[PDB]
Write a protein that binds this DNA or RNA. Structure first.
Ligand SMILES: [Mg+2]
Ligand SMILES: [Mg+2]
Ligand code: NA
Ligand code: NA
Lengths: 95, 95
DNA sequence: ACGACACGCGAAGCG
DNA sequence: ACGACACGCGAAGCG
C-alpha cells in the first residue's frame, strides 16, 4: 500500500542547535564547552505557495548552563557559562 | 533558573522533505504536484568528537502517493504519482 | 502557463 | 594543546 502523502505543514519541530563558542567568548580561544549541541524548537514546513515563507510569530528565550573548561598552561579551570537559546513557540505562513 | 544544557544526542528526529519534481518526471516540465513537502525521519544530533558523524544504521523505504496535474493546452489531466520516501530507523556515531 | 464548478470551498460532492 | 583520579568510569564520588 502507498498512503496519500500528507503535507509537512508550517509549525514548530525539534531541531539541533550547535552551541557557538564564539558567543561564549569572542576574545579568547583557549577553552572547551560541553555539551556541543542542544535541542531547540523551530518553525519548519511548507506553505501553499512561494510568495509566503514559514516564519515564527512568538519566540521564547531560554537560558541554559553549559560546562566550560579554560585551559591555562595545560591545566583546566572549571567554569560555567550561560547560553541564551531561542525557541520558536508559534509559526504562520507570512509575507 | 538556567537549566543544565542537555546534549542533542545522535538519533532519529522528524525532518521536512521537499518532494522533487525532477524525480517524478525528468523529461517533461508541464506538471504540478501536491503536496510539495512531507515529514520524514532523519538521523541528527552530535557525537562525542569530530572523528565520528551521526549516520543511519537501518533505513525504511516508504512509498507515498502524490497528486499530479499535467497541463495540456491549458487544461488539467489528473494523475497520481508514487514517491518512494526514505526514513531513517536507527543511527549510531560512526567512522 | 497564462490569481471546472449555476457559487464557494476544496474527464470531487455538499449546501 | 600537546588519546586529575591509588583505577576505571565520568582546585566529582563510588566501588
Ligand atoms: Mg449541485
Ligand atoms: Mg577512594
Ligand atoms: Na465543482
Ligand atoms: Na577522580
Amino acid at each position: 500500500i502507498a498512503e496519500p502523502a500528507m503535507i509537512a505543514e508550517c509549525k514548530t519541530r525539534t531541531e539541533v542547535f550547535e552551541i557557538s563558542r564564539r558567543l561564549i567568548d569572542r576574545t579568547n580561544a583557549n577553552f572547551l564547552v560541553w555539551p556541543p549541541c542542544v535541542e531547540v524548537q523551530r518553525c519548519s514546513g511548507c506553505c501553499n505557495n512561494r510568495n509566503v515563507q514559514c516564519r515564527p510569530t512568538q519566540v521564547q528565550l531560554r537560558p541554559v548552563q553549559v560546562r566550560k573548561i579554560e585551559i591555562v598552561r595545560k591545566k583546566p579551570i572549571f567554569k560555567k557559562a550561560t547560553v541564551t537559546l531561542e525557541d520558536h513557540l508559534a509559526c504562520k505562513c507570512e509575507t
